[PDB]
Structure formats: C-alpha cells, structure tokens
A paper describes a structure:
ASFV is the only member of the family Asfarviridae that belongs to the group of nucleocytoplasmic large DNA viruses (NCLDVs). The major capsid protein (MCP) p72 is the most dominant structural component of the virion and constitutes about ~31%–33% of the total mass of the virion, making it one of the major antigens detected in infected pigs. Here we report the chaperon-aided folding of p72 and the cryo-electron microscopy (cryo-EM) structure of p72 at a resolution of 2.67 Å.
The p72 monomer adopts a double jelly-roll structure, which is common for the capsid proteins of many other icosahedral viruses. The ASFV p72 has large insertions between strands D and E (DEN loop), strands F and G (FGN loop), strands H and I (HIN loop) of the N-terminal jelly-roll barrel, and between strands D and E (DEC loop) of the C-terminal jelly-roll barrel. Three β-sheets assemble into blades to form a screw propeller-like cap on the top of the trimer spike.
Residue numbers in the entry:
A (entry chain B), B (entry chain C), C (entry chain A): 71 to 248, 304 to 419, 435 to 598, 606 to 634
The structure:
Amino acid sequence: GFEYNKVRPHTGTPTLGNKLTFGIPQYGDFFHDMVGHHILGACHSSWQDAPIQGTSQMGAHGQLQTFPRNGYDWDNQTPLEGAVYTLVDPFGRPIVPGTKNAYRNLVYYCEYPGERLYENVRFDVNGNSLDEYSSDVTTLVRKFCIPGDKMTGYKHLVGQEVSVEGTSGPLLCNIHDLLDIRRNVHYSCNGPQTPKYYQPPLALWIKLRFWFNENVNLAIPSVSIPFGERFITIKLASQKDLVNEFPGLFVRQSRFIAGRPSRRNIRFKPWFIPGVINEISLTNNELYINNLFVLIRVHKTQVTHTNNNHHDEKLMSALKWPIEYMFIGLKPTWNISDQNPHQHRDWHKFGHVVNAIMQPTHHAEISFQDRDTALPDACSSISDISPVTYPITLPIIKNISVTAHGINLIDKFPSKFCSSYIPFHYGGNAIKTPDDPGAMMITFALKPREEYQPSGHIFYISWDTDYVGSITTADLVVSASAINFLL
Amino acid sequence: GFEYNKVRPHTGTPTLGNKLTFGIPQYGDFFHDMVGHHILGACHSSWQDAPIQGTSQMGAHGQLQTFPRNGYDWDNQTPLEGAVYTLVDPFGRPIVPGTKNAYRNLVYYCEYPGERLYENVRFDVNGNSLDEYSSDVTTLVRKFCIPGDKMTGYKHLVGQEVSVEGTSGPLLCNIHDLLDIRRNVHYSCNGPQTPKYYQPPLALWIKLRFWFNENVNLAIPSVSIPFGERFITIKLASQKDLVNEFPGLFVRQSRFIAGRPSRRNIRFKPWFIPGVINEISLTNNELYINNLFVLIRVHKTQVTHTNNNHHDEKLMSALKWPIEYMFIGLKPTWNISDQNPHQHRDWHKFGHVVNAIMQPTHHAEISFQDRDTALPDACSSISDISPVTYPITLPIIKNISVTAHGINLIDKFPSKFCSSYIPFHYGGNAIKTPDDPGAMMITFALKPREEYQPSGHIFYISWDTDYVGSITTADLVVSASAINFLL
Amino acid sequence: GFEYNKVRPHTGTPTLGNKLTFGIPQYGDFFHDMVGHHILGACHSSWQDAPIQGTSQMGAHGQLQTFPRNGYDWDNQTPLEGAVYTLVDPFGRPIVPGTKNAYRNLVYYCEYPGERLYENVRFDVNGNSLDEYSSDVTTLVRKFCIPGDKMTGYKHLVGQEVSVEGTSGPLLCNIHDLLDIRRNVHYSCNGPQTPKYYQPPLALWIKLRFWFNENVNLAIPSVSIPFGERFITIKLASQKDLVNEFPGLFVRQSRFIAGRPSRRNIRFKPWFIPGVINEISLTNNELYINNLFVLIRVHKTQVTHTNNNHHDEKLMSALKWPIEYMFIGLKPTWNISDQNPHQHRDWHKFGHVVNAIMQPTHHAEISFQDRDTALPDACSSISDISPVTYPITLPIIKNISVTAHGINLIDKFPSKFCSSYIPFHYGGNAIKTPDDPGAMMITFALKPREEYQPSGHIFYISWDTDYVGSITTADLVVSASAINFLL
C-alpha cells in the first residue's frame, strides 16, 4: 500500500543560514506526505573571567554591567551606607572575584525551534515554484489547525518542552463551611528552552506543508512528471536565531539598615557579558517520503510592512484565486528584532508582549529584648536570584475591515469578533480558538473545513490601531485557503 | 452568501435590571445566528475612613468587624498578653488609623458574567413566545456542549479570565535513581474576576441560543413572516448580581510569646465595611445578525423548587414532545443567595460547595547563646494577608430514577452513572464529560448528537438525597432536547 | 429501544486475588455494552509504637530505619557535633518517644486502580474463550483511544484523582516594558492517591472491552446462542497490588553549626516500619448490561519477556488475522516489581522512570550587634518534611523495525517517529498523541480509525536498546486491531 523512504540531501554538508536541496526519487506510483529530520549538535558557551570590584563593562544589548564598591549603590558614584557586594553563580555558590576561567554562561533554544529552523520552503519543477511558504505562515496556522489532542506530540516533534507534574507530601489544610489531608501539585520544565550549561543534541522533525501533503486523494503521480527535475529547497535559519545565552554570574547585594528594627536586605543583579557559543552541527539530515503503491487547495501567503499612524489600508496584490477563508496576523517588528532580549520567546507571537515580574522574597522577624516586644529587633528580607516572568500579549488591531471591489463587506468589526467569535462558531473540529489575541480569522464560507467541497468563496484590508507609529512598525501576515486546479 | 448586520435596541437607554428589546429587520432571505454585544462601564468603590482602635462596627453579611485594643484578643473583652494591632492595606502598606478617606475597597466581577447578564431570553411573534430560556439552562448546557478546543475563545467572549503561564530561573534539583538544571512553572490570573481598585470596561459577546441559531439549514425565512412583529426580549441581571467587593483594609496582629524559644506570630484579619460602587453604564448595545442570501429541535426547559427530606419525586408537567435526551441539575438555593459571600463564584455550580483554606506561613528559627544550642532562642511565624481558597463541589443527589407512565425505566442508578458514564459512552464528539459532579445526563437514543436524525425518543423524576432539608432547599433544572415541527 | 439491567455475580462472596464469574441472562434481543461496578471498603493501618533513641530496626523494602543519639550523624556511629533528634508526625506535631500506640501509618491507592482491579478478563461460551485481555492492554489503549474531552469522566470512573484549582489574594507584581493587581493560581489533589489516615470506600466502574461492547451494529443476538452457557470470568488483583502505606513518623534533626554566622539547620528523615492494613471488602458487585429491543474487530494481544543486550528480535507467534494497526509498548519489569517503592505510580508506564526531588527550604538571616554588619550573626535553614517528587519517564527502545515474511517493511525508524509522528498524522479524531514516550503506534492503513471499513491490512519485531540487560529485563506488550468474522 505505502512505504516511507529516506532521501539524503542533494547539497552536501548543510549549514545553519544556507540553503538545502532535496530531490524526489522514482520509487512509487504516488507520494503524499513528507517530513524532514535533522539533529542539531550539542551546545555550550565559553569560559569567562570574574571581574574585579568597582569594575564596569559593556554587556548584552548595549547595557552597562557593573560590580560596585562596598558603600555605594548599583551605580558606582552614589553612596549607599552598609552595602556589601559579592559574586554568585545562578544557583548561589560563591565565585571569588578576579579568578580567570571562573564561570560560564548558560545556553537555551528558542520557543518552537523546529518551526523556526525552516525559514523558507519552496517546491520547484524546472524552476517554476508551484508552492512556497515561510515560517510566519507555519506559526499562524499552528494556532488554528493543530487540534489539541495532537499538541503534545507536535511539541515533541518541533522540540518544544512540556511541563511535568509533581506532588508534595500530605498537609493539614482545614475546611471551613458556612481536618482533611491534602496534597499540592507543582509543575516543572526540563527541555531545550530551559537554560543549561550543556544542551544535548536536539532531534527535529518538521512536517512539510504542501497541497499534496494534506490528503491521500490529492497525491501527485510519480511518472506524470519525471523524477529528474522535482526539487525541494529550504532556506535554514542562522545559529543566532536559534540559541541564546543566560547569565552565569550574579552580583549579590547585602544591605544593613540600622534602626528599630534593624533590617537586612539581600538582592541580586545579573552580570551578563556575551560569550562564544560553539558552532552547531547538522547530522542525519533526511527527508522521509511516503510513497503509495497501487480541485486542489493552494495556501496563498503574503507579508507586508506597515508603519502608519492610527489606521491603515493595504491592498492585497498577490491574492488571485477564489478564497474560502483566511488567517490574518499583525506581528510587531520588535518581536523578531535582535535588540529584543525576549526574541527567543516572542518571535511567534502576534501582539505586543509585556512582562509582569514577580520577585518572591522570604521575610523573617526576630525580637529578643524580651521586655520591649512591641516592635521587633531584626527583620530579614531575602530575594530569589532570578524572578518569575509572565508574558502578557496585547492586540495591536482595534477594528478590522475587508473590502471587495466596490462594496465594504465588513464595516469595522472589533477585533474580538474575528479572534474569538469566528473561530468559535465556524470551523467545527478542524478549527480551534487560538490563545493568541492577535491572530484573526475571516470566513467566506458557512462550513470552512468541516467538509471537503467549497461552500462559498470570493480587495483591501483596513484597520484601526493605537500601537503602530514610525518606530513601532509591524508586518501583516496573510495566509489564505485558495482553490486552484491541477492538470 | 451571507453578511453580518448590527441592530440597535428598540428600547433606548438600557439599564441593569430592566428589559431590553431588539427588532429583527428585513435585509436577507434567511438569517440563522445572532450575537449580542454590550460594554459594561468602569467600576470603583467609594473612599472610606480608617477606624479608631478598640472600635467595632457591623460589616459585610451581618458580621461584626472589630479593631481590638493592645493586650486583648480578637474580641475586645478577653485579654491576650503581648498583642499589638495595626492596620494595613491588602498589599501590606500601613494606614495610620483615624485618617478620613484613608482606603478604598476593591471590586471584581462574577464568574462568567456574560452568562449571568442575560437573565431571561424570549422570542416573540405577535406575542406568542416561540422559544424562551434562562441563564441556568445556559450554564447547564455549557458544561456538556462546548467542546474544549473552543473553550478559551468562549471564555474571552463571556468575560471569564484565563490563567497565564510564567517561568522562574534555573535550579539545582538533584536526581535520585534506584545534577540537572530545572525550571518551575507558575500560573497567574489578571482578568475581571481578580479584585482591583479599578475595573476597566468589559466587553461581552453573548450568543443567542434558539433552534434557528444552531444550523444553517434550519434558518427561518425573512419574508415567511413579516419583519414588523418579530422581537427578542431580554431581561438583564442587576448590578448587585454582577459586581462584588473585596476588603481594602486588614488588621495586623503581632503577638510575642515569651519563653524558650520566644515566639513571634503575625496574623491578619479583614476589616470589611461595604461601600458604594458607582452605577455601571451600558454602551454599544448591538445585536449582530447573520443574514443569508440565496424537524426542528426546541430546547424545552423547566425549573422546580424542592425542600423535602431524604428523597423526592417531582412530576414533569411542562414536557410535551418526544425527547431524545436531557440534562438535569439540582442546584442549591444558597448558591444564588445574597447571604452567601461566595455567590460570585458558586452561582453556576450544581452542588454543595465547601472551601478548603490554606494559610501559608514563613517560619524562622534563630539561636545565639552559642553555648546552649539545643533549643533555639527565637521563632518567627508570619502569615500571608489573604489565604488560598479551594472550592470543593459535592453532589446533592445520591440515586436518581426517571419513570414513564406506568413502568420504572430506570431503577435507582447511582449518580456517578449519569454524571460520568453516560457522557463518557454516549454523545461522541458533541458531548463531553463535565467537571461538575451535579450535572447529569439522561439518554433515550443510542446516538444523541453524533448525527442529525432521531435514533430514539420518548413522567416522574425521583431521587434520594442527604443534603436537602427545610432550610437547605434546592432547585431542579431540566433542559431537554425535544423535537417539534415548524410550518 | 434499550435498557440497562444489573446482574449479580455467579460466584458469591468475591475476594481480592480470586476469580469472579458473571452469567449473561435472557432479557433482550441484543446486548452491546457492559460495565462492572464494585465498591472497595474503607482502609486504615495499625497502631505502632514510637522507638527509643539510639534504636534501629529493619524497615520498608529492606532498608534500615534509625533514630540516632544526640551528637551523632544519621548513622549511630559517626559523630556529628551539635545534632539533636526528635520525633514528629507527617504534619509536624511532636510524638514523645517510647509511647506505645503512638502513631499510625497513612494509606493510599495505586494510580488508576480501576484499570488494575480487573487483572484478567475472558469471555466463555461452553469453554471456548472467544476473547481475552489483561490490564496492560487496557493501560496501553487508554493512552491512544480515550479522547480528552472524556478524560475527566474516565478518571472519575476508574478512581483516579483530579487536581482542584485555587486562588490567592491580590498582589502588587509590577510591570516592566522595554502597578497592576494580580492573583496566583495553585492546584491541589484530594482523592484516593493522596495519603490519608482513613480512606473512604471507593466506587469503581470498569468498562468491559470486547468487540460487541464497541458498536451497536455489532451487538450479538441473545437467542442466537443460549443464555445457559455465556460467562464472563474476571481474575481480580490482590490487596497488596492496590493499597500502599506512607510513613506516619519522621525523625527531625536540628543542627547548630557555631561560627560566623552561626547556622541552624533543620532536616527530616522518615521512620517507615510496615504495618497491617485491614482486609478490604467488596460490596455491590454488579454487572450493568445494556439490552437492546427491536466484519468484527478482535483485539489480539501478546506479552513476551525480554532480557537481551543492546538489540533484540522477537517473532510474533500469536498474531494470525490481517491487522489494520497495532500498539507496542516495552515496559520494564521493575515498574511492576514489589521491590519498587514507586510501584503504585509506575505500574502503568512504559519506560524507565527516574525521580527528580526538590527540597524547598526557608532561609533567614539575622544580624544583631549593629556595628559589624558585613556578614550576619545567624542563619536559619528549615526544610519541609517531605519533598516534591517529579517522575521523568525515559524511553527504552532506540530504533524499531517490523518485518514481514522476507522483506524488511520498516528499516530502523527512530522511536520518536512511531511515538509522536504516526499518532500525529494518522488516526484523526480517534487517535491522540500519548504523553508516554514508550508507547508506539505502527500503522498499516492510511485511515486507521477515522472510518469503519478496512483501508489496508497485512512477522518479526526488532529493536535496539541501551537499558535492557540481565537484571533490567522487560516485557513487550502488543495490542493489534485485527479483523475476524462472526457467524
């Protein structure tokens, strides 16, 4: 019936940042689904030296890193009485400053690195690119198309970590009604997105998304066009777009405040100087093709730059054929910028991402005069070394409209109508409601993907905004489910 | 094919607690699905005064609030040696008692406020209410009918908050087998159910649930009956059923216990005097109707009061047509009572809700004599200001039976057979197993909603109970999927 | 149309560890689905005596339990200066050693005890076992077949606890962009897997899995074979395979380390001597049969022992008919061993399970004096009594192959291709991707369970491994969806 075969690359020695070519062989009558398999090599950063006290130095992202003298604030000029500074590692072990080869930075991967690895995919027959897509289309259609019963396998395929459940012991935890033992549940991550001293090799399986990769009845015949000209070209992402560093050194500030009660504060600040990650190798580069032994839906994509104030119209130039539905996302440029220290986390998000920061502290309160006992004698406040960060994604688009030749066809729907209500009502089991508030769905059929036969089809797109200005530019990603004909 | 149109209300200036009328216009050939859009205005509470020490006052829900003198317990009569009382805000900042306009209460919304806003919905043609439902039917059919891939969009539509994931830094966390870096996962909420000083305006999208709102093939024609008489009447909930207060003042008790070791306890108690929330405005009241350009299933509902001991029978008077399946829920009256301080959380639950309370405390232990060193010198125990509350829902019904004209047809199934096994086996993808243990499903067809054609159809309902008495009365909500005929 | 009837057992007084027989009566024309209902009685452990100081004793799983003298380490020989040992219960209350009937162990159930209760199920007609399965097949097909919208009802049916959400009060939690109130979310368990002093009676509903229990169109007729010979035989699990103990006594070590600063450590160690759990009773043993009033797919299973190095081949002897797909799992023997203290948790897992252990400690730092103030005067470090345990499951099989008569048909796919990609691409809504990395799916049809008609069918199974040796043996569980014919 069918069999999976491995194909080696036609290029030879693929590298991060360059192109990669596969040639489809002559094995079966049909072939429908293809998957790419790569293994990214192990990663670590270089050894660095601990600084002397009262030293400075330029760090990551154009930010000053400083190790102040005793008796001063975080800046080395302004005095702060009773301040002592030491050096720790990210887990609290001392460092003894001035030591050469003292510490090492930690390394981690981007979120969903298998979706970021294939930066551009195109399919050629004597030139003549029959289909072509990028990674923004992949991240936009994951949020609508992958069901949720398939999500934990997809995260294993693209190299995204999953949280693991753990339990504590029993507790007392009384019941009030207007006693019973009870157990806490905790969650913990361990994968490639967790900063480690050494990352293990990472196996990535990337599903190819063409029109014949979807169904078995739309598989192209192997002898209808010869095997000597069918190629698949993939432009890969660079190493700097895949791996990132975490600071391996922290400055610990202990401060005594005299008085009643005497307070003792402990705070932490990262010392982040960028090192050199070793160059990642690519081994076991393979393409698994499912050969079969015995109209079409072309995903049409377009990305456009936007920098105007308060409202914008863009005409859809590349869209040609009749369209059943489309997915629209406005992604800020700063989400994929190298000046963003949260590019590793926000590259696939379609809104403005802010960060809530919780700094949990331990507090203690000791009294010993034995006779005063109104106010205590000593207070202790100790912070954790790194805080807890919560990403909050806010939508960019306030109102949206999609206009035809002359008529309006949508008169300024609010963005929650297209982000929440249209995926809730339309689609059935094939479309889920996304967690991202910036991903929107526009429908033109009453049953978009519950069935395979067109139930309706079909050019400006206009929107209002508060975010976009001259420096806060954005990109508009449009992925439309068109209909074409193959012969 | 189809187009969404907005309809303004026929009433003019809608208010919370009153009725609201929409008139269906003459635009298309058919219309099937409708959604109501409202925006609830911003909310805050009034400024209040800090009390003097030793003062009392009647608080929230008929409960005494007291600020005791130094040297006494929480009651102002019984003496407790070494007790000092101060006033803090909910985040630990001092208040300086006697100050006028010192603090302000916090405000929040009920759980799922979009489901509670439409208290009653009916559909009129020259009078003659063709369909009518309430909010208990909506909360009962959400727990069975909304799939789960659609749940995070539905919560955005009805104004229910979602938790946001955050991560910490790396940790040590050794491995035992019979070392590796690791990261904690935390969750945090931010929405309208979180108590804040100022609630932002809340946009609500409420889907209307009639028989023609379900399918496109059952859309009623626009010219078959004229547009001059079709009305939709909605009775809205009041403001006191939507917003609630959280105490903005706490009394902090610091207690020194002399001895070996000397202990220092810090506890907290809320000072909760109700204020005046400003009156909520309703703007942008709209009805979005999907007009189409070119037998039935009527949900039949009934609610009945119940107050008998140990067992009860109720005859189903309103049920007329043949019934494919039904959903049954016994909801206690105290879940929707105004004397319940947890009405904001328990109004949509179909069981007895108790509260587990965890009070997490920080403990510290200091020894200094340097020569005794067996037992410490000082202990510190500091509580958090507000505890962690876990709602536990317990079922009311022990055994259930549904009897026909003369025969029994169900002979005392235990309630877990109808709450868990019947939604697990029957329904397919259209029915999920609910988290609420008081929501039960009775089937009469072998395939209830996998298909659209009747596979079986069809009156007392009897049950055993331990909860229901004279003062712990309850309501029986029945939502049945009947079959009628439209012409 | 249909009606559920209860059938009492034919055995009389069933016990844990023995067999149980049901006889199918003569009530309807057809019958398709059956469910078994049992109630396991209440559980507690015996009263034990607190040991004297300096005493030892052989504890649980061949491990020495010791209560050391003051001034020594955990071993009673090596000296440790400034160590004091006391006895606490699991919640921190003192015990006063030497007391007779001082404490009691805690009891809990295995994970998914309803899946472990039916250790073997077979269906007899005059002898002649038409179908037969074990509990490993049930745990293997739960991970693929139960959807996820049905999972919380299934966990209520088989007696597995669910976590309950709770919230804290509001917090400060400033926002950084490159202030707003916020609430924490916590989770907590309360069910039969939580160690308690007294376990309540546990009601178990176990669905029977035969070919006629799946569909209504494949229901066997009641008069086609007589009611006098159809039997269902169930071998039940023993009590030692169902309930387990948790230690009710801990040794608390308080240690003073003199110096600058003076440190005070508090650690805990369990004193675990096994007691006698009372014998569990079985009441309300019933079989609910759905009688109907007016080709086949036989699950073919095989388990084989394996102990070879680095690679293995096993021939599939029992597999006869054409096979649409199969599920394969390699489960270590130590997962079901009685020498494993984590048998209660790992019996249903198909990999090597290691344990990460987090020991959260409270730390405090006090400085009196007032003139030195560089380094503190006293440090406090207090542990929790029991730590937080995270199970990590690692796969045993590295590469897998399934060979036909002469040809290879699979040439060493890596195990993530069969654990993740094949459930992701094939199956549709009927197959989900499992969380267990050792459960693998092999397909032979292009649409395994999206439809009911065979879309392809069909013997060695070989694999590479790093885990399996002479003492780390394993079992191979194969559950295949064959096709047979009934007449």
